Amino acid sequence: PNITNLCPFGEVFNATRFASVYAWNRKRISNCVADYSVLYNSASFSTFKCYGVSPTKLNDLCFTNVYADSFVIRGDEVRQIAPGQTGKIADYNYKLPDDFTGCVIAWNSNNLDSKVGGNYNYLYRLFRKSNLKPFERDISTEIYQAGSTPCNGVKGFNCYFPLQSYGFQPTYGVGYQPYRVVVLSFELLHAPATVCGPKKS
Amino acid sequence: STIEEQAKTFLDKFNHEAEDLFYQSSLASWNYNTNITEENVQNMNNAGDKWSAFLKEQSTLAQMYPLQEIQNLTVKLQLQALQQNGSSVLSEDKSKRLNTILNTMSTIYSTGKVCNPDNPQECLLLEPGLNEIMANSLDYNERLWAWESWRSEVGKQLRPLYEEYVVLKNEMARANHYEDYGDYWRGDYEVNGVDGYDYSRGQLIEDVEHTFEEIKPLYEHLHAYVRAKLMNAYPSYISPIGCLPAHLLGDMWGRFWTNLYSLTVPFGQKPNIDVTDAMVDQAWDAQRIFKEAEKFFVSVGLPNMTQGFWENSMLTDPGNVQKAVCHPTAWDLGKGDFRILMCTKVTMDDFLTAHHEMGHIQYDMAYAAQPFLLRNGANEGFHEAVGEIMSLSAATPKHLKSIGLLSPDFQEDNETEINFLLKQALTIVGTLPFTYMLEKWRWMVFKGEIPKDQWMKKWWEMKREIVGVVEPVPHDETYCDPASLFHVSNDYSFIRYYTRTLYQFQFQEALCQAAKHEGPLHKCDISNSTEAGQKLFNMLRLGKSEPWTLALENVVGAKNMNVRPLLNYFEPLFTWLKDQNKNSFVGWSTDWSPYA
Numbered sequence A: 001p002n003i004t005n006l007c008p009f010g011e012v013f014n015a016t017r018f019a020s021v022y023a024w025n026r027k028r029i030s031n032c033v034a035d036y037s038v039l040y041n042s043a044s045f046s047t048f049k050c051y052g053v054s055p056t057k058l059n060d061l062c063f064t065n066v067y068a069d070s071f072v073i074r075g076d077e078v079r080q081i082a083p084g085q086t087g088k089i090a091d092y093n094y095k096l097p098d099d100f101t102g103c104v105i106a107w108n109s110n111n112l113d114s115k116v117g118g119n120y121n122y123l124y125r126l127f128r129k130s131n132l133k134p135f136e137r138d139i140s141t142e143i144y145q146a147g148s149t150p151c152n153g154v155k156g157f158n159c160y161f162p163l164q165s166y167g168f169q170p171t172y173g174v175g176y177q178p179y180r181v182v183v184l185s186f187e188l189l190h191a192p193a194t195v196c197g198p199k200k201s
Numbered sequence B: 001s002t003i004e005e006q007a008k009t010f011l012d013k014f015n016h017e018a019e020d021l022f023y024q025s026s027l028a029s030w031n032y033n034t035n036i037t038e039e040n041v042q043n044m045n046n047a048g049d050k051w052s053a054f055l056k057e058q059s060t061l062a063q064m065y066p067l068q069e070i071q072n073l074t075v076k077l078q079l080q081a082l083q084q085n086g087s088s089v090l091s092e093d094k095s096k097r098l099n100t101i102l103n104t105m106s107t108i109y110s111t112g113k114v115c116n117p118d119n120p121q122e123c124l125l126l127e128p129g130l131n132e133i134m135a136n137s138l139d140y141n142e143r144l145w146a147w148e149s150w151r152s153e154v155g156k157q158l159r160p161l162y163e164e165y166v167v168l169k170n171e172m173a174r175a176n177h178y179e180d181y182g183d184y185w186r187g188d189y190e191v192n193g194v195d196g197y198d199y200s201r202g203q204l205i206e207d208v209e210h211t212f213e214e215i216k217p218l219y220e221h222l223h224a225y226v227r228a229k230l231m232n233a234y235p236s237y238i239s240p241i242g243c244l245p246a247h248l249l250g251d252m253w254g255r256f257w258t259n260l261y262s263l264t265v266p267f268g269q270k271p272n273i274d275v276t277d278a279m280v281d282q283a284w285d286a287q288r289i290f291k292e293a294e295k296f297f298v299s300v301g302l303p304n305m306t307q308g309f310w311e312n313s314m315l316t317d318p319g320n321v322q323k324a325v326c327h328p329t330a331w332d333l334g335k336g337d338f339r340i341l342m343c344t345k346v347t348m349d350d351f352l353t354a355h356h357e358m359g360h361i362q363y364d365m366a367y368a369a370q371p372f373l374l375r376n377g378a379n380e381g382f383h384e385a386v387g388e389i390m391s392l393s394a395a396t397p398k399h400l401k402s403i404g405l406l407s408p409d410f411q412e413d414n415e416t417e418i419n420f421l422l423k424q425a426l427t428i429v430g431t432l433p434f435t436y437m438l439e440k441w442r443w444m445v446f447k448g449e450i451p452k453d454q455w456m457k458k459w460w461e462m463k464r465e466i467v468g469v470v471e472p473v474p475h476d477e478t479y480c481d482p483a484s485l486f487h488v489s490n491d492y493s494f495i496r497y498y499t500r501t502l503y504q505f506q507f508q509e510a511l512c513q514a515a516k517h518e519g520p521l522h523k524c525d526i527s528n529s530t531e532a533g534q535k536l537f538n539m540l541r542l543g544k545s546e547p548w549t550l551a552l553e554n555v556v557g558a559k560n561m562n563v564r565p566l567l568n569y570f571e572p573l574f575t576w577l578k579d580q581n582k583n584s585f586v587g588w589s590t591d592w593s594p595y596a
């Protein structure tokens, strides 16, 4: 029939500021019409790697909920946003499951997220005692204990601050320029699936 | 848990903050170099003080991890590099005195202005006022006046300063568990802990003497030929049996002999390989020069330049309003930012310099995957050698014909190859005894073999024995003749040029054997060869992670620096010089026979 109520993809992709990778934003998208061909046919995306589903049948299938996780990482760290990968982002910041169904969309944002003095508003958890579970968020700012001695809250010897800033500048190389990453997670649950694609007339 | 994991976490909180501070400092230095303004000087000084204070605090924090409880070789290498005290082990009063001495030597060398007595209304600085006189004059007493007046002023200012400098540097080095400051400089080539590939600080001097003993016949024949030609240029001053007078070598100190190519050319009647006019006729911009260099590096299989390279480099003189340093320098600013600062003219020299500096950029890009404190050459020789091999390959007539800069019907006979090889020998072979003699003299000064009252009597004795160059008039101990040169007055190692020269021809033979070149070594071009680029990039990707002996095994298949590729490179010239020296006398006498 006649279709209205499009899914809010403008508030995810066209957001004026993105979150840090340690505190990645998660938006649950439900009960609307998701047009994925607008994203796939855009020339503005550098990575559109979909795992577990193909982009051509996205516009046909229907899903119960859509999870839109948004963050900013480096250029060389986009490869770590994948199932089964290893690195600082995968182990300590944002972990994807092996049985992941969804798409990882990344694009260069050196124009917005880099300033000439250095943009230090973006952080990445550099140290944690254990690797993250999939879809876990760690926003703790407790001092990492690398040694037997107790830290006692002071960043002294062997006791380091967990979150380390990225220093984005516009004169950086392509492997160090900021990349905005949106990960869409598609799951089907026993509840009635309500996020369906648009139907042609 | 364990000490090794603690050191690894410390090395990560080092690396990640260090890369960003080194970036800030390097960007401030770049903004000073492209824009000489006093606030940029202040910003550079602030960034440098932050960088030095951060290195002091991390050196203070790195020493608390003992070395013998760490088994991973790379972690131990980074911790060894970080745990050096440097000047920090010395007391604050003596450290301030040493820093003041270094700064005042820098000001004396940089702002040294000398002109003729009784005509003091204007004076000439070293660059370019004295350089042009030394490189272009044909008058004996004018060059003698300039040489003696500059060594009088500079040496009589710098001699007590150098006497303080040697004592302070020896104190710092023995405080750092070294024998002397010469051992500290030789510790750059020290490899410890690798089975078979270990290299000692004491083996460096033995290897340098062993290679120079094989250098010596070629240099003796070249010296005899240059002596005969300078006898033709200056009829009565030069003796057939004696050494060359010091002020006649075409440069201020005798560092290079390349300004004597006009006087000592074998076949003037034959044409030159100058390609300047051809680029002027086709209107080659400096952008086209760098694009042709990039085409050379993509032809061998190396990665091409980043977009940020073309956006952020200064390849042209900015103008009258904005001042910049004219010296060509390749900058690895960090974080994938690679730039070249060169005031590029349309000349062959600037084109070869563009190839040399883009070779520096390729070397810097190759070890970008390494951790921050391992982002260097395996030694100080490789970093310059990988640019000099590009300077070798780009200068070949095959490369000039391939890019269209030379006529395809240009006749390559043996005479042009002889005079080209003689020019390359005056540039390359002539600097080797001067470099070896200077480093051996500085090593003997630091070791205490030469007392302070006997520095110059030994020094000229060394120059007659090794370089075959005699002083015009005798100098007493009020002179300081070595410290008139840039590297020795500003605390720089000097053996990097000797090691660079030998590694250059070793790499050249390795890549030409890889490229299956079937002719003479100097006729060899490494373009179009993917396997030569792969053999290069295997060593290039290592950086400082592996020992330089293992890197040399990776390229040439040898565990030590070798002298035979250089002699193979100049073998047509060696046979020609042996043919031309039948009537004349090869070798020199250390006596005062020409003039004293």
Ligand SMILES: *[C@@H]1O[C@H](CO)[C@@H](O)[C@H](O)[C@H]1NC(C)=O
Binding pocket: A009, A010, A013, A014
């Ligand atoms: C986001 O921004 C781009 C460029 O500004 C624009 O073309 C696009 O329509 C916007 N919205 C979406 C949903 O992509």
Ligand SMILES: *[C@@H]1O[C@H](CO)[C@@H](O)[C@H](O)[C@H]1NC(C)=O
Binding pocket: B035, B037, B322
């Ligand atoms: C160089 O410095 C001057 C200082 O007055 C400034 O006005 C100018 O914009 C600078 N130029 C560049 C290219 O940085």
Ligand SMILES: *[C@@H]1O[C@H](CO)[C@@H](O)[C@H](O)[C@H]1NC(C)=O
Binding pocket: B008, B072, B073, B074, B075
């Ligand atoms: C040494 O440490 C690096 C990481 O810092 C690691 O990749 C490498 O495998 C280690 N080498 C050995 C022999 O354990």
Ligand SMILES: *[C@@H]1O[C@H](CO)[C@@H](O)[C@H](O)[C@H]1NC(C)=O
Binding pocket: B063, B083, B084, B085, B089, B176, B177
């Ligand atoms: C550096 O100096 C400190 C203090 O003098 C000393 O404890 C340390 O052993 C020195 N480092 C080395 C490598 O000798």
Ligand SMILES: *[C@@H]1O[C@H](CO)[C@@H](O)[C@H](O)[C@H]1NC(C)=O
Binding pocket: B304, B305, B306, B307
């Ligand atoms: C480097 O080479 C690749 C492939 O040949 C090309 O796509 C790229 O545009 C080149 N880089 C630049 C800055 O032109």
Ligand SMILES: *[C@@H]1O[C@H](CO)[C@@H](O)[C@H](O)[C@H]1NC(C)=O
Binding pocket: B414, B415, B418, B576
């Ligand atoms: C160059 O080649 C010609 C032709 O054989 C020969 O006569 C001449 O002696 C050669 N000269 C040298 C220096 O090899």
Ligand SMILES: *[C@@H]1O[C@H](CO)[C@@H](O)[C@H](O)[C@H]1NC(C)=O
Binding pocket: B299, B398, B402, B527, B528
């Ligand atoms: C290298 O390859 C290019 C591309 O085919 C070719 O034009 C050039 O002539 C080659 N170089 C030589 C020396 O043949």
